[PDB]
Amino acid sequence: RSLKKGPFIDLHLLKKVEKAVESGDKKPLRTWSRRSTIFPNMIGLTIAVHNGRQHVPVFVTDEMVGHKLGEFAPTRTYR
Amino acid sequence: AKLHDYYKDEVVKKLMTEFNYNSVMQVPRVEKITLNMGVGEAIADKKLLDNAAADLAAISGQKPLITKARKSVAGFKIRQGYPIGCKVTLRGERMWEFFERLITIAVPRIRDFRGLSAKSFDGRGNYSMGVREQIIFPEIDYDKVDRVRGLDITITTTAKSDEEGRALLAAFDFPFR
Amino acid sequence: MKKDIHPKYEEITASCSCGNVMKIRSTVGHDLNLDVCSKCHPFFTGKQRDVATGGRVDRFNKRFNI
Amino acid sequence: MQLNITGNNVEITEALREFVTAKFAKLEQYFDRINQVYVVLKVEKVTHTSDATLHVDGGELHASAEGQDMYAAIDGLIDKLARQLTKHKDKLKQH
Amino acid sequence: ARIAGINIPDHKHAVIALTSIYGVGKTRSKAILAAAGIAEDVKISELSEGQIDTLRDEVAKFVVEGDLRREISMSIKRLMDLGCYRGLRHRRGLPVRGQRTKTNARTRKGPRKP
RNA sequence: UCCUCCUAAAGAGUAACGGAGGAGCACGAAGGUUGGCUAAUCCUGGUCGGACAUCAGGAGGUUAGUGCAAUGGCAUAAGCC
RNA sequence: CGACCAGGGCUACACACGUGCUACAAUGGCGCAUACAAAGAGAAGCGACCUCGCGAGAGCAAGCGGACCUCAUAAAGUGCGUCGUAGUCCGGAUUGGAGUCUGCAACUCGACUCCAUGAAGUCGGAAUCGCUAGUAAUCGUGGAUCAGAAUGCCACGGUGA
């Protein structure tokens, strides 16, 4: 619930998706940009969001679109 | 008697033309409807059963029979022959007027009413449901009552299997999914 | 039927909001004035709104427009 | 009486907390109704010192004991606290 | 005294009396009476049935009891099915919005068992 | 001291510091008659309600039940109103 | 063990303690109308008026390095109306949806607005604190730090034992 106009992505995630979608479904994309949204042309990819010491992969599903990449990668581990 | 007559000259045509019956008495007619209200809190309060015996006397149109405990189980602190429930069996015309009252004004006043369950059959064609509120009936005036309890309704038909009960109640436009 | 044990049971007229004046036999007071009945109760059409509800891409496409 | 251990440069191990707690409970039972107790453990390169503050109905009372191994300091502090408690107890009996 | 499924208070004024419906408060409850031509300080006994039926379809516009409860259950169960951070807090009973958890957190927690 | 079963050897009876269990009452209805009815235990469906309380249906056919031990009996019921 | 960058953490949570804010209501809640302050801040800043928006706010845009312009409507109070002692028209926590603003960027982790949701709480055991007069107790306002982010701190007045 922020950012009135346009979603947010970096150029190193937007150009990295638009590079690696037309180049076939490939290797999981290491990404450090947790703060970026999930566009509908990212559905079907295994992207590995960095949580601080890992790059945890999450398969992008259709419901995950309005959220951000860091939302599906927890940082602190409890028990 | 209204949807008794509707049974007399629509549902017989629907069921004979769907189920190609040889005899007319192969049709499933409904035999009775039994309204149970099993209390359980009678061992905590003996005169609380009288409040339950007044509800079915107003939901149904006749004085209900209190039902004793058959077995003496210690798991619910009862003994042989302690009154723990109340049934009322209505037949004849009282079940057709009660059926019209039910599916006409009393089922829709169940709040948050989705389509009614259709899995509820005994495998012989006898429907059984349970309603959680007394407030769904206009006789329960909601202002003089004390606790919200429920009851359960058993529609006992002469169906040979569950599918004939489905087609019978579906011929009465009983609500389902 | 037995006498002098059963409640009163009178044919009354129950009318609803959408206009279904119908006289059935019950044990209520003067007469009944309903709102909903077998008619004008959404168990026949107004039931399929909970299915055509979800999705997130369709929500997302009010923000791109390019 | 709840007791509240803290340590400046002294890593409070679980065996250390068990012993201190037992000693404090024993003292509390013996002398007076006690509401709360704060324990502070300090190490200053040589001196294993301990502070304690007891909140009792009359009020605060405090003691401090330096030792050699922490345990000794704790024992000294507890004996000092007991002595202080005897004084406070019949100080408010005084019939 | 029967709209949206329940609506049974009486001797109360109307805009306060409608707020026993799960889905309406004091703003939408004023929107119902201002949109249905009823003054706000009348009582439910003082309404005639020819007004109350015009309030039933009026409150049938905004989402009420059952649809709102299964809708909110669809929202929370949806988030818990995704397994995001928020739904991950919903699966465990801790504050979702990012409140303090070191000290208070106690409405979402409950009572204190130890 | 009394009751029931076995020992007890297919009539009865039959011993042991042989093997197992009970009684020293209860009921004016739990007796008499007349009228009526039929269980246990599982499965299915059913609001709280579960593994089991109450309702309906099916299987089943006395595997129950008898005021109290065990044996014999009981449907024509000796079983339940 | 120095230096640079990205992401995280400093915000974790079975629990324990301290300091505060809001309550538990009728000396009150809500709605309308209306009276009275002092102190202060402002140039990549304070931002009138006018339009749009329920609203946070947006667009245009004067003025002011200021006893002038702006922040900036003081609130408690007062008059009227209602609520009639209930978990209530108290309380406003939590959670869902929709937004706004700031900043590359509000997921971890900002503030605010709107709709909905409506928890504990019916004055607090043992123990404990402040306060002698414009004080206590309440009511609002401003500043610093600051892109944004006070229920804290530092100030100022109102009512006033």
Where residue B111 sits, what CATH number does that domain have? 3.30.1440.10
Alpha helices in chain C (DSSP H): 57-60
For E49, the enclosing helix (H) or strand (E) is helix E49-59
Q: Residue B131 pairs with which residues in a beta bridge?
A: B151
- CA-nearest of D75, D58, D68 to D24 is D75
Taking residue E40's Cβ as centre, other Cβ atoms within 10 Å add up to: 12
C40 is in an annotated binding site: no
What residues in A contact E78, CB-CB < 8 Å?
Answer: 63
The answer to whether the Cβ–Cβ distance between C14 and B138 falls below 8 Å is yes
Question: Distance between CA D20 and CA D74 in Å, rounded?
Answer: 7
Please state the φ and ψ torsions of residue C25, each to the nearest 5 degrees: -115, 120
Give the C-alpha distances (Å, rounded to integers) separating A5 from A2, A8, A38: 9, 9, 15
Q: Residue D40 pairs with which residues in a beta bridge?
A: D6, D51
Could you tell me if B176 lies within 8 Å of chain C, comparing CB atoms?
A: no
The answer to whether the Cβ–Cβ distance between B108 and C1 falls below 8 Å is no
Residue of C nearest to B108 (CA): C37
Residue of A nearest to E86 (CA): A71
Resolution rounded to one decimal, in angstroms: 3.0
**Which nucleotide minimizes the distance between its C1' and the CA of B52?**
F54
**Which nucleotide minimizes the distance between its C1' and the CA of E72?**
G96
Would you state the structure tokens that stand for residue B80, as one six-digit string?
A: 């042989």
Burial of D11 (0-12, 13-18, 19+ CB in 10 A): exposed
User: What letter does residue B82 receive in the DSSP assignment?
Assistant: -
**C-alpha angle B157/B161/B165, rounded to 5°?**
45
Question: Distance between CA A60 and CA A41 in Å, rounded?
Answer: 10
- CA-nearest of D61, D50, D36, D54 to D7 is D50
Contact between E81 and E75 under an 8 Å Cβ cutoff? The reply is no
**Packing angle of the helix pair B12-19, B162-171 (nearest 10 deg):** 140
Residue of C nearest to E54 (CA): C17
Domain extent at residue B154: 1-177
Our measurement of the distance from residue A11's CA atom to the centroid of its chain's CA atoms, rounded to an integer in Å, reads 13
Q: Residues 16-75 of A near strand G (Cβ < 7 Å)?
A: 32-35, 50-53, 68, 70-71, 75
Task: Tell me how the structure was determined.
Answer: cryo-EM
CA/C1' separation B133–F35 (Å): 42
Contact between C7 and B57 under an 8 Å Cβ cutoff? The reply is yes
CA/C1' separation E114–G15 (Å): 7
Question: Distance between CA B107 and CA B130 in Å, rounded?
Answer: 11
Task: Please tell me which chains touch E, using 3 or more CB pairs under 8 Å as the contact test.
Answer: A, B, C
Residues 6+ apart with CB under 8 A from C28: B138, B139, C12
Contact between A33 and A68 under an 8 Å Cβ cutoff? The reply is no
Q: Which CB contacts under 8 angstroms, 24+ apart, belong to B145-153?
A: B146/B51, B147/B51, B149/B37, B149/B39, B149/B52, B149/B55, B150/B37, B151/B35, B151/B36, B151/B37, B151/B55, B151/B56, B151/B59, B152/B35, B152/B36, B152/B37, B152/B38, B152/B128, B153/B33, B153/B34, B153/B35, B153/B102, B153/B128, B153/B129
Q: Residue D54 pairs with which residues in a beta bridge?
A: D37, D61
The answer to whether the Cβ–Cβ distance between E2 and C35 falls below 8 Å is yes
Min Cα–Cα distance to chain C from A53, Å: 30
Query: Structural domain tally of chain B?
Result: 1
B20 Rama sector, left if φ>0, alpha if ψ -120 to 50, beta otherwise: left
Min Cα–Cα distance to chain C from E49, Å: 9
